[PDB]
Design a protein around this ligand. Structure first.
Ligand SMILES: O=N[O-]
Ligand SMILES: O=N[O-]
Ligand SMILES: O=N[O-]
Ligand SMILES: O=N[O-]
Ligand SMILES: O=N[O-]
Ligand SMILES: O=N[O-]
Ligand SMILES: O=N[O-]
Ligand SMILES: O=N[O-]
Ligand SMILES: O=N[O-]
Ligand SMILES: O=N[O-]
Ligand SMILES: O=N[O-]
Ligand SMILES: O=N[O-]
Ligand SMILES: [Cu+2]
Ligand SMILES: [Cu+2]
Ligand SMILES: [Cu+2]
Ligand SMILES: [Cu+2]
Ligand SMILES: [Cu+2]
Ligand SMILES: [Cu+2]
Lengths: 334, 334, 334
């Protein structure tokens, strides 16, 4: 076709774990969906100890925002690298076909911008990330990754082909960081990205992250920033990991319907306790809350969750169901 | 309903890898199934070198026993923490809905007990484990985990919906331990759990287990404690890993039908060589033995199996089938 | 039956990533397929730095060659261990049933040979590897592994049961090496395999590979040895990892149909970005190229890919499709 005859819609992205407004079932024909992201290199405090890294971000956040389109829409991304940044960046969409996912076409020095268009031909949730030749893992593990959801035009379907509709959606980006350590086990500090590079590579080559966090920091999805729901609500949690395997688990719940490797033409796995999202993948889990209270949402390597950071909370409001669970005899000395 | 109108059945658990008597197809309506477990903190020798750890157990074993119920039964667990123990414990069932899987309702100091009830609303094999706030991975990686199987009321079914009936069942719990090491690489020893805690955390944060074992120790499922079967028998092996990924493989056999992430509403994967059970999950594999002899059942990271401990044996009796395999020319010099 | 009444066919194997000529749909009844492999212990340079290891190979290559048969063919392997080698070797086929996959029947000292026959009763791609009692992971992680493909007699089928036919096939064997390091982080060197053994075990027990490579070396599948295809061609990539999990990804493409755990009686997963092949498994991915240019095929732990070696290239020829992807505004300063 002539792409110029298609409707265009502009989307202003929002900060994770929230997701820009969209419709599950497409209310228009195929569209060109316009997004803009501005790269920001910035200092970020990643843990309760105050460890501060030089993060590389799309749009100021770790992860980058979730983009949402429908199958056979076109994604048109304006990517801006302001002259206040120091490094070369680009973008690779796992949703796209050709040119290293767009990375070969989007190399931007500080002070430059570019616009890429691609057709979103496959439905699912997909990773996107920076990937500059020769320095790929350093950019990705400095936070330069996010996800895109390409919904089927008729929305999500269960294992029998009936509709699944979510009431709320959240995006959890999980980030493995590799802060260099000295012989004593202390975090080392660096004056410029160039001076950091070799020790960053050495730290990555240990294959042992120092931190594994949701939404950019230890505890980011707790307290006043806990996720929320009500009993009876249907929630979709999109979860990505651009570099390393993870295994999400909702403590006190389940994944009712899970696309662990994130691709919606496949039937979901039912009734999961824990699911494996391979590094370089996004997955999606759908759950209907049945009990109120605090839930922990974790990577179920519990060391990764509770010592390294990969844990957040839901706060769920509503009625307690004593048929589903009850204390028969509360803890006591007999 | 009124739960008080339902039948009650008490189950005395048995030590892994054996499993308490049960029926695959439910011969009664929904029931309240009563279990009791007594927590035991004890010294355990985990390897041939005589390395001794302070283990934390449900019912005296690593793993804890396998509980077996049917879908929409109620599980009523009396959990006892005798005053001979030192630590606070609780229990989180991945099978249950609400209150952190029961963990928020079951916190017991030494000298206390509690009774929890939950409805087993989802069929599958599931992990259970201790999870005291602030110290979760330490308890789990000290051995405080097991599994529960919630059978469909009409038993297991193949990928076409026809019945699969097992003749024997075994439960293999795989445990990653993190014994702290000094600069020389020697295992460190500790006088109290409190004095152990920080070094236990440091050792866990390496993400590198020192030992990975079946049934609590290197070689536990070998020799006089090898698993057994006969040619033609259908065997279900339930396998759990509460904290870390594993990849079971029967050396010389297959998983004919595998629920790698353990949930029986999904069709099984057929003809598997090796399957991935994510950390925080239980899985189940069904196989019909076709040849006699010794089999090794391993985690197929072969370093994990043969150097760190994650290997056991089957001893299978019966007829050799020369059509399936034969030596044509035995090893010789020509 | 009488196996002596069946047709015999001899196959001369070829070096990975290429695959010996075969037919997808079986043009004969069941056959005895005769293969010969000669073990070669040899020095191999594995990285750009010139690190040289003592490799243990089937047929001179890492990985060993891909064998291809059809379901219910018999595989008859003549395994030769020349007297120029030093070690004991054998072979375990994950495709086979009994005797530790053949390992109990194929133990050959230098100067010996043996012939094994087995019936290939399950369709799929499977690992084979050396497995001498007491020294299994050392042989496997020194390169002594490959794969066998057992095709359904009516070829591959999609998720709806319609035929999938590949135009080209490649075999990517991914190898984790554990070169021992000293306190400084330098690779240690050894005079005999016996003198190497304990430090090889210590290095393996770190669970941290020093190198992770395709086809035996960093960069082996690049440059003049890049994989090739044309736009519109259907390509099957068989990928094995005998010891450790991997997560393949075609940068700029997808897995249109993926058997991540490699067994063809199961429906494929569709539209994958990245898939998890557990250690001890072979998997297979089918893709139809839609854009020309350079693609990177990687393990999507990007540290493993770009720092440790697990990356190769496709060079694809043909027409660029501007509907699928285009640069709208090339990188520039505004
Ligand atoms: O960018 N990682 O959440
Ligand atoms: O039950 N999750 O720890
Ligand atoms: O929070 N990780 O050290
Ligand atoms: O729970 N009251 O014993
Ligand atoms: O408790 N782990 O087998
Ligand atoms: O074939 N298992 O090592
Ligand atoms: O048995 N593990 O050192
Ligand atoms: O196997 N007898 O040569
Ligand atoms: O033998 N490994 O590619
Ligand atoms: O998109 N692969 O890096
Ligand atoms: O190429 N690996 O160090
Ligand atoms: O791409 N030309 O602005
Ligand atoms: Cu970047
Ligand atoms: Cu990528
Ligand atoms: Cu405990
Ligand atoms: Cu848990
Ligand atoms: Cu060998
Ligand atoms: Cu094997």
């Amino acid at each position: 076709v002539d792409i110029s005859t298609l409707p265009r819609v502009k989307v202003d992205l929002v900060k994770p774990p929230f997701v820009h407004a969209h419709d599950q079932v497409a209310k228009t024909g195929p569209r060109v969906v316009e997004f803009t992201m501005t790269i920001e290199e910035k200092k970020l405090v990643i843990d309760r100890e105050g460890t501060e890294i030089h993060a590389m971000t799309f749009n100021g956040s770790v992860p980058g925002p979730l983009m949402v389109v429908h199958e056979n829409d076109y994604v048109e991304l304006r990517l801006i690298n302001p002259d206040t940044n120091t490094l070369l960046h680009n973008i690779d969409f796992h949703a796209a076909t050709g040119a290293l996912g767009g990375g070969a076409l989007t190399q931007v020095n500080p002070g430059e911008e570019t616009t890429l268009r691609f057709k979103a031909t496959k439905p699912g949730v997909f990773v996107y990330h920076c990937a500059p030749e020769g320095m790929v893992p350093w950019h990705v593990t400095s936070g330069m990754n996010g996800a895109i959801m390409v919904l089927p035009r008729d929305g999500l379907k269960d294992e029998k082909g009936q509709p699944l509709t979510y009431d709320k959606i959240y995006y959890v980006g999980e980030q493995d960081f590799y802060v260099p350590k000295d012989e004593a086990g202390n975090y080392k500090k660096y004056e410029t990205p160039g001076e950091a590079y070799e020790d960053a590579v050495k730290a990555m080559r240990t294959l042992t992250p120092t931190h594994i966090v949701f939404n950019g920091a230890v505890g980011a999805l707790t307290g006043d920033h806990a996720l929320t729901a009500a009993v009876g609500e249907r929630v979709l949690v999109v979860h990505s990991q651009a570099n390393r395997d993870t295994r999400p688990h909702l403590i006190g719940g389940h994944g009712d319907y899970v696309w662990a490797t994130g691709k919606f033409r496949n039937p979901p796995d039912l009734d999961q306790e824990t699911w494996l999202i391979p590094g370089g993948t996004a997955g999606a889990a759908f759950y209907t809350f049945r009990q109120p209270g605090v839930y922990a949402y974790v990577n179920h390597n519990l060391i990764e969750a509770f010592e390294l950071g990969a844990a957040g909370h839901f706060k769920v409001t509503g009625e307690w169901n004593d048929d589903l669970m009850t204390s028969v005899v509360k803890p006591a000395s007999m």
